[PDB]
Amino acid sequence: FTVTVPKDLYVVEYGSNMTIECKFPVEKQLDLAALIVYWEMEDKNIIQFVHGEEDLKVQHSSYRQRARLLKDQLSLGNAALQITDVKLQDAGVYRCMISYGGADYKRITVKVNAPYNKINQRILVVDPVTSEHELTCQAEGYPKAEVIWTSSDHQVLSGKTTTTNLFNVTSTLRINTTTNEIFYCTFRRLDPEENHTAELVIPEL
């Protein structure tokens, strides 16, 4: 009796859905009365499956309403763990243990990437007479990102960035400008360098 994993490394994007496969030999008809399934992640209990019975109250709080064992896959020898809306705390080493006329287990490493690729922008006309505009870009991600404001000719402009807690980074640029002028807000993380940029076009008043 051996449990096998087709992949022991998963790299997943924040907020996505993930199914970790965990295979074990089943001959034709699954004997539910002899099957135990245990999904664990670094002292956190995810799935405690006994002869078809699960009790959601023993599932760790951080996984509640997000982690489930696919019963359809179980019948075919695949103790597949599905995690929806993946978070940063889902990164780690998962252990899937199967008891089914013998017992075995395998480790699966999960990495979660949270890039700043969803930039929310807004442009406010705070004073039409003086043509003063307030440009704001906000994004969530990990790790910490700096925000660089540039003009259309790529000259760096001075804005105000506020970082609070996954990081929530917002930055605001107050500038006197006119319709159709173009500005860029760039969210930059390092080690290694990764950039995500939104283009902001000054609209009609």
Partner: peptide, 15 residues
């Protein structure tokens, strides 16, 4: 272990 209503711990133990 292996009561589905009780917490478990690695490996095949009480949690």
């Amino acid at each position: 272990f292996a009561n589905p209503h009780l917490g478990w711990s690695w490996x095949x133990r009480x949690g």
